[PDB]
């Protein structure tokens, strides 16, 4: 046996029992002809193939699939035709692959979700009450205070992660809970205990639907109802413990000491190795389907024998969660710091200006260009890498609708500033000090501010690119193409006046050009440089006399604002599909 323990219920659904029914649904990619009705208190497992390309049956039922469309039939939820609003208000979909933030605790993870799902009229005591009820129901009081981390591997077990993934859906008290592959990656005992947990959730006035391919013997015995499919064609719908009798009474026995789910699935499976076998097996499957439809023709249900949080509160919650998670992730912060410091020290030492012969004009200009141009190399890769790692969470959270793109947009941009500013300090200050650049507070501060704005613009560009292209490598390619274009158009490597129309237009919007020109108008503004030679004419010769320094700052701000508009439109209009 496995294990017996407390089977009490702690968090039950308080509303009227809900229903879900499907009437002659025909979906092609797909699903040929399904009819069923289930009610609160039952648990329906779906076994066999049952799906379609890149979308399971449960995604078809919730009305959010891909690569196909519903051709006929109806889906009804709580007596009403299915719609995106009924799905959002009733269906707690738990996906096969999602992630929780690595460095929050269970209490913190549930607390942040609770703040974003429960009505704004709840007091904090009521939200803490709800979180504790969910923790009690899922048997998480022991290990409630540990890390939910996946990337942080040390922490709570995979079973407990699965339970937390269920809890973040249970918090808003759903009536219909739908799970896709709940026992995936779990051990035998863990999967068994998880299925019993799902049974208790069903017991507490809820409807639970489970998509489960190839269930084990001991898991099959725990099922209340089972829907057996070979393809989109159903074979049997009804009580799991009577499934064998159904087949035995229609001429297809099953041996003792053979799992019913595996044997029947293999018996009705449609091999495509040859045309003769595929033809014979499709004919067999259609015969069994017609036979079932006849068997339950005269039997009912085809079964054999509140104000929400506003944008500001959502923003506040997202910014606190983002800052809380990333500032506990110390290895990444140390790596980013170490890379910025080592790079700034190498640039500083190469252009060292204290214990040496004073830097030439052209060496100083090369230095200022290198200070600007050599930074995006790491910034682009880490912003794109981080954005791609977060698409699963963003996609499913926006799909569920606990927040809109506005609060996420602002929280995402603002949350990197406590790391960005430290990064700018570490990168900026050792080069300005090691290479003997212009003394005084005002040059130093103007240099720092210009570098800060340019790197910010770079981050917004990479952020907009990562959210626009469907994959990591295409977004990386696009970002490097813009970076290399801006680099060449920067005006140091090639002359700005000796340009064809389109490179001139590229130079006009190149943030590395404005970075270079600004730094040059700080180091050589009104200072006399020993070559004496007036700085103003020297800047004029290189065609850097026009556009006063404040306009350079405004232009960099404008370019960042442009990429912000692109990023916002990108996220809202184009879906951030995972992987």
């Amino acid at each position, epitope marked *: 046996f496995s294990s017996e323990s407390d089977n009490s219920l702690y968090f039950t659904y308080s509303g009227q029992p809900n229903t879900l029914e499907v009437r002659d649904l025909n979906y092609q990619v797909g699903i040929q002809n399904l009819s069923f009705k289930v009610r609160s208190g039952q648990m329906l497992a779906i076994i066999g193939s049952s799906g379609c390309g890149r979308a399971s049956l449960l995604d078809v039922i919730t009305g959010r699939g891909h690569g196909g469309k519903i051709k006929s039939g109806q889906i009804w939820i709580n007596g009403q035709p299915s719609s995106p609003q009924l799905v959002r208000k009733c269906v707690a979909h738990v996906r096969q692959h999602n992630q929780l933030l690595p460095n929050l605790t269970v209490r913190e993870t549930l607390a942040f979700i609770a703040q974003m799902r429960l009505p704004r009229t709840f007091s904090q005591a009521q939200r803490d009450k709800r979180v504790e009820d969910v923790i009690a129901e899922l048997r998480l009081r022991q290990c409630a205070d540990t890390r939910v981390g996946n990337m942080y591997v040390r922490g709570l077990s995979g079973g407990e992660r699965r339970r937390v993934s269920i809890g973040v859906q249970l918090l808003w008290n759903p009536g219909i809970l739908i799970l896709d592959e709940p026992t995936s990656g779990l051990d035998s005992f863990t999967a068994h205990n998880l299925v019993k947990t799902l049974s208790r959730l069903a017991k507490g006035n809820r409807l639970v639907l489970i998509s489960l391919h190839q269930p084990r013997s001991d898991i099959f015995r725990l099922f209340d109802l089972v829907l057996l499919m070979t393809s989109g064609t159903p074979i049997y719908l009804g009580a799991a413990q009577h499934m*064998v*009798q159904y087949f*035995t*009474a*229609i*001429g*297809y*026995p*099953c*041996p*003792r*000491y*053979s799992n019913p789910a595996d044997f029947y699935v293999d018996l009705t499976s449609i091999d495509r190795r*040859s*045309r*003769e*076998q595929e*033809l*014979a*097996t499709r*004919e*067999k499957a259609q*015969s069994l389907a017609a036979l079932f439809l006849e068997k339950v023709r005269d039997l009912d249900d085809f079964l054999w024998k509140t104000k929400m949080p506003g944008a500001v509160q959502q923003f506040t919650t997202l910014i606190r969660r983002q800052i809380s998670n990333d500032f506990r992730d110390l290895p990444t912060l140390l790596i980013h710091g170490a890379e910025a410091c080592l790079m700034s020290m190498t640039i500083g030492f190469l252009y060292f200006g204290h214990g040496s012969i004073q830097l030439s004009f052209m060496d100083t200009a090369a230095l200022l260009f290198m200070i600007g141009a050599l930074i995006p190399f790491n910034v682009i890769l880490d912003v794109i890498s981080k954005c791609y790692s977060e698409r699963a969470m963003l996609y499913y959270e926006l799909e569920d609708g606990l927040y809109t793109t506005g609060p996420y947009f602002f929280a995402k941009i603002l949350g990197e500033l406590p790391e960005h500013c430290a990064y700018i300090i570490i990168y900026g200050m050792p080069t300005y000090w090691l290479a003997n650049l212009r003394p005084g507070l005002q040059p130093f501060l103007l240099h720092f501010l210009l570098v800060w704005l340019v790197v910010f613009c770079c981050r917004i560009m990479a952020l907009a690119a990562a959210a626009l292209l469907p994959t990591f490598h295409m977004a990386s390619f696009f970002s490097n193409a813009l970076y290399n274009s801006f680099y060449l158009a920067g005006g140091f490597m090639i002359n700005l006046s000796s340009l064809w129309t389109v490179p001139a237009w590229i130079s006009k919007v190149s943030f590395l050009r404005w970075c270079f020109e600004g730094l040059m108008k700080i180091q050589f503004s009104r200072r006399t440089y020993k070559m004496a030679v007036s700085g103003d004419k020297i800047l004029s010769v290189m065609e850097l006399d026009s556009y006063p320094l404040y306009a350079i700052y405004l232009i960099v701000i404008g370019l960042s604002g442009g990429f912000m508009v692109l990023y916002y439109v990108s996220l809202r209009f184009i879906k951030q599909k995972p992987s």
Partner: antibody
Amino acid sequence: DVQLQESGPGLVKPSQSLSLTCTITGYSITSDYAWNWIRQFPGNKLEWMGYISYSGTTYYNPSLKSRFSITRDTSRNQFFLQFNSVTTEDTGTYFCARMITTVYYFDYWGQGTTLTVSS
Amino acid sequence: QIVLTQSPTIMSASLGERVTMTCTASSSASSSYLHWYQQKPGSSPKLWIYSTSNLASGVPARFSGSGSGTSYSLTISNMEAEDAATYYCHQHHRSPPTFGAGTKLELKR
């Protein structure tokens, strides 16, 4: 080594009852296998009649509609058949067989009995 | 409901010849559920070949069979005296299971 031995009435008249039995030894009929009856007409044509699974679930083929039933007694392990529709067309040889339920085939067969029905 | 037919109904051949028997399904059948049975006058049929190509225990390893779809066949590479029997084709692709009429081979003299 499983023995299937049929027995029952020889010559009977139509519109009577008629119960043929298959005594099975060497293997209990409460463990695996589908346990069925097969008929052969005097023209050397085999016809499958029906099975009683070890669970007690029975199945009879169509185009023999409500003509017969198959029963059994647990401890004794006899296998039974009672066709009320005792029409003269049912003359022939009957025999019981054991079905293997992984891939459906008949490995063990009995010896058979000859049933003659007429007035 | 699948009807099985067999051919030749009655055939004869001398000892040592290669002999084939054909079973045709009225629809189609999966290869795993086709079985052949051998019956001699005086007694019940015995299992001869199951799942088209797997030989039953006790058959003296000179019999074979093959097929797919709607066409299945049984072959004897070299006939002996003990092969003078009726061979029945059986399927359980779709219930109820059915039998063919059988082919009867005789020995030449």
